[model samples]
Target chain A: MNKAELIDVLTQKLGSDRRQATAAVENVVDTIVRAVHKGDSVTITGFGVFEQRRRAARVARNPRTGETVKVKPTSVPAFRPGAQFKAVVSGAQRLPA
Target chain B: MNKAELIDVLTQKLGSDRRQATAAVENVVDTIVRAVHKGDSVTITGFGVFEQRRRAARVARNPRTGETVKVKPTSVPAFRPGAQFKAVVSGAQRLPA
Candidate 1:
């Protein structure tokens, strides 16, 4: 589902107006983005954790010239699904198909 | 940060009461979970996309028994970070340290 469909689901589940639901969704997204950008992890139980994984600087070979190049360290955002979420998606639970 | 801390951030940014913020966060989480469980993808622009990846059933060797084992097909939850989110976390942008 896209953002609009997601907002609809939230509106139904939370019994909130479309504008309110949209604001809520946007708030959560922004919060997660800001936290990860600030080098912090956002963990939601039974859902997943959003965090940055650091890659160390390393030497990389230049395919064309066969010369070693420096690869700078960097961070990448990742999501690790929670156990419950994993189980559900894996069909370990008798959830609706 | 944990769920509580995330809620605090949402409350601050959305200017909503703590209870409402918590509910809003929960709504989003539930919406995503339900979508993935129903074999749908939840795509939030500039943040990430949450979806279920299918793993086909295959044959695998048992390390201890040195025998072949059957692996069942299953679904797994995954998130692919958006370009904007990647840039921010990678320090490609001059974000606060």
Candidate 2:
């Protein structure tokens, strides 16, 4: 589902109106991004953890052109699906760990 | 940061009351899990994409005991950070791709 539909779930199921729903929804995303930007992680138990990741400068190959590209080192956002998320998606009753 | 701190971001910055904030927050988490549970992808532009992944059963040796172990096939949740997320976290002016 897209953000709008997700917001609908937040409002209809949770009894929040659209204004508050939108605020809460956007803040969730905004706060996560800001936290990761500041080198912190936001972990929602059973859902996932969002964090920052940086890659070392390296030479990478362009498969189609058979060319070696000098890729600059860079930072990026990362996420790890929590145990609940993994279990639910895998259709497992519970997680081993 | 943890879930409570995340909710604070929602309430203080977005000006939503705690009750509504909490509901919207939980619903967002719930909605994402349900969508991925159904083998669908939820893509929030500039943030990330959430989806399901399944791994094939395989045989692996236990490093500690050197005993071969047969691992059952399983499903899981996965996320792919978007370009904006990558750029923001990396502190790069922009993403190459």
Candidate 3:
């Protein structure tokens, strides 16, 4: 679903106005971004954990030229789904497959 | 950050009551989960896309018995970060490194 449709569902589910629902969703996204930027892991127990992962600098080949290039270290956000989420998506029992 | 801390930040940022903020966060989680379950991809443009990935069944070895075992196919949730998010996390320019 796109943002507009999702906002509609949230507005109905939370009994809030569409504007309020939109603001709430924006807040959620902002909060997550800021938290990860600050090196904090956001954990929503039964859903997943949003955290940063670092990739170390390395030497990589240039496929076409067969040249070695330096790959710089960097950070990236990752989400590891919780067991409950995995189970639900995998069509397993609430606990496990 | 944990759920309580996130709710606090969201409440302050959105100027909503703590209860409302909490409910809004819960709704966000539920909305994403339900959307993926229904085969819909939820995309928060600058953040990420939440979608389901299917794993095909495969044969794996049982180390102890040295026997092959069947790995059943399954579905799992996945998040692919947007360019903006990747840039922010990687300390790159807003557009690219």
Candidate 4:
């Protein structure tokens, strides 16, 4: 399901207009992006946690070249699905209503 | 921020009662979960994609015991953040309004 399709589902689920549903979807997304950008993690129960991860600079030898290389540190966004999501996906548990 | 805090933000963002905002949040989460549980990927622009991943069963040798192990195939939930999420988290771009 793409964003538009998701919005359609929200509209039906909320019993509201499409615009309101769209706004709600946008707000949910923007809020998560904003929070993670601030170096804070957002955890939705039965879903997952969104956060920023940082990798430290390191020196390593290239296997092919047999030469040392320096890798710069970097940050990126990440998400780890919670138990419920995993269970539902694996069919170990049923998806909730 | 946890689920409750997210709902609080949604309430403020939606300028609606807490119940409605909570329902909105729940709907968004449930919609995504349902889609992924159906073997479909959910892609939210500027956010990420949620999907089910499957791994094939494989055989591997234990390094210490020189023993063979059979790994069962399994399915799991996974998320891959979008470009906007990566850019914002890395401070390479500003968060959208």
Candidate 5:
């Protein structure tokens, strides 16, 4: 499901209008993105936590071409699924209603 | 921000009642979780994609005890942040309103 599809699903599930559903979806995504950008983690219970990670600058050889390259330190987003999410995915626990 | 904090933030941003905001939050999370559990991927634009990954069963030696152990293949939830998400975190793009 893409963004529009998710919004449509939420609209049906929540019995809300499409505009409202769109706002709800956008708000959630926006909050998480902005928070992570500010070096804050967002933990949605039973799902996962989102944060930022930075790799230190280093030199490495490319395995494919055996060429040396300089790698710059950079920031990227990361997520760790919580226990409940893992359980659900692994079939150890039923998904919540 | 945890789940409750996110709900509070959404409530304020949407100018909606707490209960409504809570429902919105849960609906979004629930839909994604349920889809991923059912072997479906949920991609929220400008945010990320959520899916499932399964590691194949294998035999492995424990370095600590030098004992052979059977590793069972298991399913796990995974996420890959989208381009916009990476850009925002990397300070390459401004967050959308």
Candidate 6:
């Protein structure tokens, strides 16, 4: 479900009007983004945790040239699904290789 | 920030009552989890995508014993944040290397 469809679900299930439903969506998203950007991990029980991750600068060997290259350190957002979410998804379906 | 805290944000910013805000949070999370489990990814623009990943069974080397082992295949939930989310987090903070 996309944002629009999620808003529809929020409107119906949440029993709120368009304006409030939209705000609810924004509030949930913005807060998560802000908290994570600020370096505080946000944990939503039964859902997941939104956190920031930093990859250290490292040396890599070029496959063709055998030359060493430097990869710069970087910051990024990450999420680890909660136990409940994992259980449900794993139980629901798993395509075989 | 946790689930309850997020609900507080939703109620305050969205101008929603406690009950409705809680339901809204659940609706959003449940929808995404359900969609992903069913082999469809739910993409929330400016936020991220929730999807499933299936890892094939593979052979692994045991560092201690120098023996090969078989790693069982598994299914897991995954998330990839959107561009906006990435830009904000990357710009906000990055721990020193």
Best by lDDT: 5
Task: Kindly give the stretch of ten consecutive residues in candidate 1 chain B with the minimal lDDT sum.
Answer: B88-97
What clash pairs does model 5 have?
none
Candidate 3 stretches with Cα past 4 Å from truth are A60-68, A94-97, B61-68, B94-97
lDDT per residue, candidate 1, A3-93, as tens digits?
Answer: 9998898888778889988888887887788888888899999899999899999889999999989999989999999998898888776
Error of 1 at A78 (Å): 0.3
The top-ranked prediction according to DockQ is: 5
True contacts kept of 3: 0.80
Instruction: Write candidate 2's Cα lDDT for A25-54 as tens digits.
Output: 677887888888888999998788988887
- Pairs clashing within candidate 4: none
Name the regions of candidate 1 deviating beyond 4 angstroms: A58-70, A94-97, B58-69, B94-97
In model 4 chain B, where is the ten-residue run with the lowest total lDDT? B88-97
DockQ of model 6 vs. true complex: 0.58
DockQ sort, best first: 5, 4, 1, 2, 3, 6
lDDT of candidate 5 over B1-97, digit per residue (tens): 9999999999999999999999999889889999999989999888999999988998999999999999999988999999999999988898765
Q: Which candidate is the best by TM-score?
A: 5
lDDT of each: 0.87, 0.80, 0.84, 0.90, 0.92, 0.83
lDDT tens digits, residues A1-97, model 6?
7889878877887677877778878879988988888889999888899999998998899889999999788788999998888887777433231
Q: In model 2 chain A, which range of ten residues has the least summed lDDT? A: A88-97
For model 5, what is the error of residue B23's alpha carbon versus the real structure, in angstroms, after optimal superposition?
0.4
Evaluation by TM-score, superior candidate among 3 and 5: 5
**Candidate 2 Cα outliers beyond 4 Å, as residue runs:** A94-97, B94-97
* TM per prediction: 0.83, 0.88, 0.87, 0.87, 0.90, 0.81
* Candidate 4 off by > 4 Å: A58-70, B58-69
- What digit string (tens of lDDT, one per residue) describes model 3 on residues A1-97? 8788889999999999899999988878877877787678999877899998988998899999999999988899888988877777777745321
Candidate 4 lDDT, tens digit per residue, B1-97? 9999999999999998999999999988898888888889999988989998897998989999999999788788899999988988887897655
Angstrom error of the Cα, residue A97, model 5: value is: 5.9
